[PDB]
Every structure is written in structure tokens, then in C-alpha cells.
Short mmCIF file of C-alpha atoms and ligand atoms in Angstrom, two decimals:
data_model
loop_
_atom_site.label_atom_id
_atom_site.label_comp_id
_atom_site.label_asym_id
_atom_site.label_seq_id
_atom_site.Cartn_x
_atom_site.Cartn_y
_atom_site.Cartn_z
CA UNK M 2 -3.97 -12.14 17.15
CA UNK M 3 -2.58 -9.41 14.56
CA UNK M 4 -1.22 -10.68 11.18
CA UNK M 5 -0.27 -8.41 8.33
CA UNK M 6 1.08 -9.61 4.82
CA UNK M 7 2.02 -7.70 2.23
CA UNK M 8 1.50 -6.90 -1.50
CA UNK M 9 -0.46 -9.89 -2.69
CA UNK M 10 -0.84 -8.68 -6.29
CA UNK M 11 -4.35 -11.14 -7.04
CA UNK M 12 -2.51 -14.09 -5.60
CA UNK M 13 -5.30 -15.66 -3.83
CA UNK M 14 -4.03 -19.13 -3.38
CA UNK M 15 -1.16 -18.05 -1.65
CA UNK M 16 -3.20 -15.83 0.22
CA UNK M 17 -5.77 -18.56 1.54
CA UNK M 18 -2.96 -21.25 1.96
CA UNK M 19 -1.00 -18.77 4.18
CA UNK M 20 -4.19 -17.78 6.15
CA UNK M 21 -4.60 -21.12 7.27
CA UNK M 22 -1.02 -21.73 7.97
CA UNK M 23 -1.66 -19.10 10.99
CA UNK M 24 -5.15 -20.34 11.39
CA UNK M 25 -6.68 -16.76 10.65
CA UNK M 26 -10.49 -17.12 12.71
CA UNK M 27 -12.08 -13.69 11.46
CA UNK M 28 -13.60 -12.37 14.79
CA UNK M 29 -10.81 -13.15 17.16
CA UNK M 30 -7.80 -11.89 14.92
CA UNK M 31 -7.70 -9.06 12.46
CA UNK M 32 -5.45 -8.84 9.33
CA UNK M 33 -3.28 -5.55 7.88
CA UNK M 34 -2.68 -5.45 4.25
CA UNK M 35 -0.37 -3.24 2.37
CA UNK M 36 -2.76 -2.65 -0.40
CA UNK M 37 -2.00 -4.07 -4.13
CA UNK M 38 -4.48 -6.65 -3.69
CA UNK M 39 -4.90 -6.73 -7.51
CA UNK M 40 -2.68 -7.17 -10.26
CA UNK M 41 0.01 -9.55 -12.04
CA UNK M 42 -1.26 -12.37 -10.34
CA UNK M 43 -3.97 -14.62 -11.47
CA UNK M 44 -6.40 -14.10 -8.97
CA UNK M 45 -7.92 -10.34 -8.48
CA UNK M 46 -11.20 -10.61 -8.51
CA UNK M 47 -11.32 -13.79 -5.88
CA UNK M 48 -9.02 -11.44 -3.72
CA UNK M 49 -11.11 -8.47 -4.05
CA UNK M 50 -14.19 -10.98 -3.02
CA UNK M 51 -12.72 -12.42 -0.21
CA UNK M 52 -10.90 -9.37 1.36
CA UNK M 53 -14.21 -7.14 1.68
CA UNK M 54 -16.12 -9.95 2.31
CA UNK M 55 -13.86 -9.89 5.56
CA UNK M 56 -15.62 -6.37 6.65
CA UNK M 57 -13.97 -5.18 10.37
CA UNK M 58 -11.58 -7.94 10.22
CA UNK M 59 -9.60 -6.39 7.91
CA UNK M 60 -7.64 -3.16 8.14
CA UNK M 61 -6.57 -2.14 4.36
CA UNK M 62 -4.53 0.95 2.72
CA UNK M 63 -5.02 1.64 -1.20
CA UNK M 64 -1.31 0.67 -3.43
CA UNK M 65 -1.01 2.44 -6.81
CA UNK M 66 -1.68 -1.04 -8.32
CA UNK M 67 -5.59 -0.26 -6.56
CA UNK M 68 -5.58 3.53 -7.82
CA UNK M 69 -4.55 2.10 -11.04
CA UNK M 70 -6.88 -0.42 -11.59
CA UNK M 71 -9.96 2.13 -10.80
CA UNK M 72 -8.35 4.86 -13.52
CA UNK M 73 -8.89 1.91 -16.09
CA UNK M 74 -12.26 1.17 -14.10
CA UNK M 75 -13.53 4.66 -14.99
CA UNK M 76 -11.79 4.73 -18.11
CA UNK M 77 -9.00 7.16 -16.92
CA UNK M 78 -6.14 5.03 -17.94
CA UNK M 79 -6.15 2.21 -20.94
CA UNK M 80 -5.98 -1.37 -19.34
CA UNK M 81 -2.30 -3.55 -19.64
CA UNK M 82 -2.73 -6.93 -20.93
CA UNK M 83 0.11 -7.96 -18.13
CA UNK M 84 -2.04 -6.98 -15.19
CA UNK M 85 -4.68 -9.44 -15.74
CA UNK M 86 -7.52 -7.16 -14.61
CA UNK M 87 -9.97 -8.82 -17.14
CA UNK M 88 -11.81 -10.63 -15.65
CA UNK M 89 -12.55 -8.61 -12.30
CA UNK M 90 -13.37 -5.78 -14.93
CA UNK M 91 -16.02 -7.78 -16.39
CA UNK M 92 -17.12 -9.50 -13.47
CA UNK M 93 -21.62 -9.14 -12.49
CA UNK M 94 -20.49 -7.51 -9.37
CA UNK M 95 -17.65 -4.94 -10.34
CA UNK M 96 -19.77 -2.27 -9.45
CA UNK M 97 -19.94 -3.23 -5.61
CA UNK M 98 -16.04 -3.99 -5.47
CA UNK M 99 -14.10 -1.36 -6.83
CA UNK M 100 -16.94 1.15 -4.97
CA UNK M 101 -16.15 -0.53 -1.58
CA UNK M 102 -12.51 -0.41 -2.86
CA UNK M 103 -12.33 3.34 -3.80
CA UNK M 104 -13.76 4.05 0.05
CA UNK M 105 -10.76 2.41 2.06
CA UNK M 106 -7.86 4.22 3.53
CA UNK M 107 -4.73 5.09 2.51
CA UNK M 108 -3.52 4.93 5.97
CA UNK M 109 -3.66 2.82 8.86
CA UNK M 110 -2.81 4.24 12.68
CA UNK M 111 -3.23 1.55 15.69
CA UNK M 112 -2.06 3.87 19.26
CA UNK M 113 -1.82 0.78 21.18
CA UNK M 114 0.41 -0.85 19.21
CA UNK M 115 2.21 2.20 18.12
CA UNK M 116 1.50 1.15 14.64
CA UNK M 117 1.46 2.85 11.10
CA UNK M 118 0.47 1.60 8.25
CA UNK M 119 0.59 2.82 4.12
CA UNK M 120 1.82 0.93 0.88
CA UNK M 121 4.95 2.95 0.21
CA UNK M 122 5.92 4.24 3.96
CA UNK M 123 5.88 7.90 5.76
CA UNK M 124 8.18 10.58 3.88
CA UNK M 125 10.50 11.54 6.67
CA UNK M 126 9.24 15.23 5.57
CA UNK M 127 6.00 14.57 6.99
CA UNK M 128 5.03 14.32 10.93
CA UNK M 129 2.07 12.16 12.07
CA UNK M 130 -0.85 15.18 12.20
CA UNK M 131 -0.01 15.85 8.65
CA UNK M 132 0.25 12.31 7.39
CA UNK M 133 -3.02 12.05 8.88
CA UNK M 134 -4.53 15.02 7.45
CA UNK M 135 -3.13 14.40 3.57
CA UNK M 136 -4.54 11.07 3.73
CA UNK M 137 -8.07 12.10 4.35
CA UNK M 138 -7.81 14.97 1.70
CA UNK M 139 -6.86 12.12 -1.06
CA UNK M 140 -9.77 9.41 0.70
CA UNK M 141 -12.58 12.18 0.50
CA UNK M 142 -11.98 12.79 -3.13
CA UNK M 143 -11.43 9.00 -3.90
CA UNK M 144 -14.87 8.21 -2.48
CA UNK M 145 -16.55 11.50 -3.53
CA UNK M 146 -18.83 10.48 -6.87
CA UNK M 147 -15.87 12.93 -8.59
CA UNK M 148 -13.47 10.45 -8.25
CA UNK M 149 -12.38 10.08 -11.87
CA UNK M 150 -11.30 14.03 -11.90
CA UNK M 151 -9.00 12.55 -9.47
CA UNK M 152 -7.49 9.39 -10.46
CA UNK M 153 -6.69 11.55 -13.71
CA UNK M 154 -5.21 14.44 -11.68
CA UNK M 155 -3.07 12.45 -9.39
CA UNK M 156 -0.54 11.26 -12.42
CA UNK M 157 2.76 13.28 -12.48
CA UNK M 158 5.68 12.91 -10.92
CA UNK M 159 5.71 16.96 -9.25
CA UNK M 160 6.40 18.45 -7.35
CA UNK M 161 9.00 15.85 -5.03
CA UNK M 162 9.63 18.60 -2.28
CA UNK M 163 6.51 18.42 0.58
CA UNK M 164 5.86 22.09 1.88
CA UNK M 165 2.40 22.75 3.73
CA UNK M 166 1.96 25.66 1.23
CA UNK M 167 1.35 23.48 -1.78
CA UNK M 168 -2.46 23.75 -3.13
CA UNK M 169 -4.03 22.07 -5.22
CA UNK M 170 -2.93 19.45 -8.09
CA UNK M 171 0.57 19.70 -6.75
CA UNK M 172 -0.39 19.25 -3.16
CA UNK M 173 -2.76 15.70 -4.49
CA UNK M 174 0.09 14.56 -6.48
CA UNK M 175 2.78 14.51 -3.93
CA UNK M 176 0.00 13.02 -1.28
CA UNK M 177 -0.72 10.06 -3.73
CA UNK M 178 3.09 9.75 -5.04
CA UNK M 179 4.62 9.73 -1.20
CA UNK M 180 1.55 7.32 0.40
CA UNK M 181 1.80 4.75 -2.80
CA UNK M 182 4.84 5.37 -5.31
CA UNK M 183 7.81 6.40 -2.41
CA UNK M 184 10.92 4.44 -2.41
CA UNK M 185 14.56 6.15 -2.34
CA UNK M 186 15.21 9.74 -0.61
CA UNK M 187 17.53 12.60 -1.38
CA UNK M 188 18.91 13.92 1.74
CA UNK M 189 16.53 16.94 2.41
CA UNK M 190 14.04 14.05 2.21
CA UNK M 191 12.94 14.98 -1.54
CA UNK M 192 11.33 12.02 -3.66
CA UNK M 193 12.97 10.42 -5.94
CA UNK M 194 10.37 8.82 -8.00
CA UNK M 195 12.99 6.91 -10.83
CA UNK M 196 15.39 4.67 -8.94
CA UNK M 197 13.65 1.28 -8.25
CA UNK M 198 16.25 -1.25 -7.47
CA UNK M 199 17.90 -2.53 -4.04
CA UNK M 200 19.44 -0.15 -1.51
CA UNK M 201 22.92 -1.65 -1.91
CA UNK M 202 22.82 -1.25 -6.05
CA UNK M 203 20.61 2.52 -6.14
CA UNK M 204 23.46 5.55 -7.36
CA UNK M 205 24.29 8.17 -4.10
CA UNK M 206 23.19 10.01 -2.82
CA UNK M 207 19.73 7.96 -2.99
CA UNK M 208 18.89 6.49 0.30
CA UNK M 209 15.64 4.42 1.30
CA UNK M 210 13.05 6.07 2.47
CA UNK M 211 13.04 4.72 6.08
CA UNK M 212 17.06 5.67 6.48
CA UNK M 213 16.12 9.09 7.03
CA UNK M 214 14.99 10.29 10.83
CA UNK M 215 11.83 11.24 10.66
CA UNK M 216 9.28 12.23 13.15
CA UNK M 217 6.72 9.82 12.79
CA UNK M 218 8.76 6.60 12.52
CA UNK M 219 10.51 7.86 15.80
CA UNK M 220 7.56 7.52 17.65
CA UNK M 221 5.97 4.42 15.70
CA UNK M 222 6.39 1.31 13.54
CA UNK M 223 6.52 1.60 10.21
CA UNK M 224 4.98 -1.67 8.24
CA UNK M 225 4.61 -1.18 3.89
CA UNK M 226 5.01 -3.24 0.89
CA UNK M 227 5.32 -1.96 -2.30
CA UNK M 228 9.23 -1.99 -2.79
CA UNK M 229 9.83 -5.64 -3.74
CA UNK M 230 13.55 -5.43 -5.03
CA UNK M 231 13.79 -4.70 -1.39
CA UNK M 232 13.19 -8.12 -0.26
CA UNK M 233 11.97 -7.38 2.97
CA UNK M 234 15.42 -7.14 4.27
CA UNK M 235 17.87 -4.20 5.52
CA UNK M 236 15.38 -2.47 7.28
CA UNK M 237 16.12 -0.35 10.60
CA UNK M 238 14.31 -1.50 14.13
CA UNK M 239 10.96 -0.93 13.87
CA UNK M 240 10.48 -0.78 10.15
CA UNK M 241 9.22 -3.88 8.22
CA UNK M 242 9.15 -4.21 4.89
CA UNK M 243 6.92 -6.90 4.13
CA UNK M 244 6.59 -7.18 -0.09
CA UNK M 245 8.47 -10.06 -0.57
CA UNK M 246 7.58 -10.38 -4.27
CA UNK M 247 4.93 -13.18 -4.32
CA UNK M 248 3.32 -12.26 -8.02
CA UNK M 249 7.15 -12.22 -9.34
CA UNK M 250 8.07 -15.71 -7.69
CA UNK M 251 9.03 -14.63 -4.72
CA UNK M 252 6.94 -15.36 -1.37
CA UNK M 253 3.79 -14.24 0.60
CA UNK M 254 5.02 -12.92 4.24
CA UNK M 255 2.77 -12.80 6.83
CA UNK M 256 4.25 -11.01 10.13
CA UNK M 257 2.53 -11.61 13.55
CA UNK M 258 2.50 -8.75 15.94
CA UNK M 259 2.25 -9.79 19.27
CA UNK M 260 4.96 -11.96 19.28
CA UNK M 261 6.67 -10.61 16.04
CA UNK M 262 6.75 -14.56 14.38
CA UNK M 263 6.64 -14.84 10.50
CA UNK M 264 4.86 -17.44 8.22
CA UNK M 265 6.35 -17.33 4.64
CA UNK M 266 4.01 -18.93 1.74
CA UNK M 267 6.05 -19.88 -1.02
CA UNK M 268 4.33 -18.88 -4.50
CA UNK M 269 3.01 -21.26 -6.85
CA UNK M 270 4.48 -19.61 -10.30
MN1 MN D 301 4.09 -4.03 -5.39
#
């Protein structure tokens, strides 16, 4: 079987009790996850542990809650107390975690399924082949030994406005902003990267992401987290939202693809 959950946000009991729940057997099932493993909750490090301990089984894209917490790693950006990333900084095997973490994708393509994966969605200014190509520019420099000239670059909210002939720190910016940051759309399909409440309560003429044609999600599914005042609800066919705000007090989601069943974990704070 397929199962994907979204953001878990170091909530590792939920995580483990929902696994069960849909009797997750590593080997004969494989599991999608939007990416902010770490985070708010109480349990990054265990998550970290357990999700690469999971090797093939796992299929994984990178949140900005993930780029974030390697910026503080290499001492980029200055560490929040409410993120609770203390004691996976200081952990004996940090080292071997946030390496493995900094090699993993930022997106996620399955052509049987007709599948598509990343943490924020696919800007409706972007077609598959160039999806695909932006996310390996952004994965070889996050695993090159370079990557803190990176992490540091990729802050900044400019340029909005994807055109194939932006270079350069422009060009990484909008990658990382539209793969992990992306929410509402301006009509021409220009980031907005300031409104983050519901659909329903954003100011026109905002409009989600995934309201937009665009020439990927015509072909494919669309599955993200990220966007929690979303609520996993109000989505088109074939999109699913699945950040239903577990860290917050919300719940874990776990979607099953073949026959499309969910399995909600409800969280324990
Ligand atoms: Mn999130």
C-alpha cells in the first residue's frame, strides 16, 4: 500500500500511533511525507531517527521548517526557542541526520500513479520539465559541501514572477520560495509570499495556489502540506492538502492511495 501524511512538525507519537493505525509493514508499503518533519513539536530528533532509519520505504521532500533547521545547523540563522530544535542540535549523531537530511529531494514524481509531490505545491507558472529541473538545481547545491553559501542565499522574498531567464540568486530564491514557502497566487500566477490565512478570509485578488490552471496539475495529482490554516479542505479534484495542523492541535492525516481512505490521528497537545 501507499500512505502519505503530512507536516508532522517533530510529532513522533502521533506519527507512530497513526502508523500502526494503518498497520505500516516497511517492505510491502511505502510512505510520502510533505517534509517539516522537525519543529514545534516535541519530538524532532526521534522523527528524524525513525524516518531515515526507514531508507527506500520512505519517499521525502525538504519543508522550509528542514531548510531552516540546517541554516541554524551551520550557523546561518540564530536558533528560536519555540522550535524546540535543542535537543536534535545537540544530539551524538547530528552529524549523520541533518547530512542524510540535506541530500533528500525537494520533489517527488511517481508516473504510475500520476503523482507529484513538494511541501508548498507546483506554481501554476511552472510545467513539469521545469519543476523537475529547478528542483535538482536547489538539491545539488543543498548536498554539495557548499551548502551553507546556500541556505544563506536562499532568504528573500524576490523576485515573485518565474521567467526561465532568471540567473542566479534570484533564480535559487524563487526555486526555494515556490517548492517550500508558496501559498496564495495573483492572477498571472505571481507569489504572494505575505497572506497566510484561509482561502475564504485572504483580501482579492489572492487566490490559492492550486485555483489556478496549470500545466502540471492538469496532467497529475498534486499532494503538499505546509498551508495549515488551510485545513486540508476546499481543494479542487486531484489536489490534497494534507497539513492538518497536528503541532498546533490540530490532527495527523494520513491519506491512502489506492483506495483514497484516510486515517486521522488526533494530537496529544
Ligand atoms: Mn507547516
Amino acid at each position: 500500500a501507499t500512505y502519505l501524511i503530512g507536516d508532522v512538525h517533530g510529532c513522533y507519537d502521533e506519527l507512530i500511533a497513526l502508523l500502526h493505525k494503518v498497520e505500516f509493514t516497511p517492505g510491502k508499503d511505502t510512505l510520502w511525507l510533505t517534509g517539516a518533519l522537525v519543529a514545534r513539536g516535541p519530538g524532532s530528533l526521534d522523527v528524524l531517527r525513525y524516518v531515515k532509519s526507514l531508507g527506500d520505504s520512505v519517499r521525502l521532500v525538504l519543508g522550509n521548517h528542514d531548510l531552516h533547521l540546517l541554516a541554524v545547523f551551520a550557523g546561518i540563522s540564530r536558533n528560536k526557542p519555540k522550535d524546540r530544535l535543542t535537543p536534535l542540535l545537540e544530539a551524538p549523531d547530528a552529524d549523520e541526520l541533518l547530512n542524510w537530511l540535506r541530500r533528500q529531494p525537494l520533489l517527488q514524481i511517481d508516473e504510475e500513479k500520476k503523482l507529484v509531490m513538494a511541501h508548498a505545491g507546483i506554481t501554476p507558472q511552472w510545467d513539469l520539465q521545469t519543476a523537475k529541473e529547478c528542483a535538482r538545481d536547489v538539491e545539488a547545491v543543498l548536498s554539495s559541501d557548499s551548502y551553507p553559501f546556500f541556505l544563506d542565499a536562499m532568504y528573500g522574498d524576490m523576485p515573485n514572477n518565474w521567467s526561465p531567464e532568471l540567473r542566479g540568486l534570484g533564480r535559487l530564491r524563487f526555486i526555494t520560495n515556490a517548492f517550500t514557502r508558496m501559498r496564495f497566487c495573483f492572477p498571472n500566477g505571481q507569489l504572494d509570499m505575505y497572506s497566510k490565512e484561509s482561502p475564504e478570509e485572504a483580501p482579492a485578488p489572492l487566490k490559492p495556489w492550486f485555483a489556478i490552471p496549470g500545466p502540471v496539475a492538469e496532467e497529475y495529482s498534486i499532494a503538499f502540506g505546509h498551508w495549515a490554516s488551510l485545513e486540508g479542505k476546499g481543494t479542487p479534484e486531484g489536489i490534497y492538502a494534507l497539513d492538518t495542523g497536528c503541532c498546533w492541535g490540530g490532527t495527523l492525516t494520513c491519506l491512502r492511495w489506492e483506495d483514497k481512505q484516510y486515517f486521522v490521528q488526533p494530537s496529544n497537545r
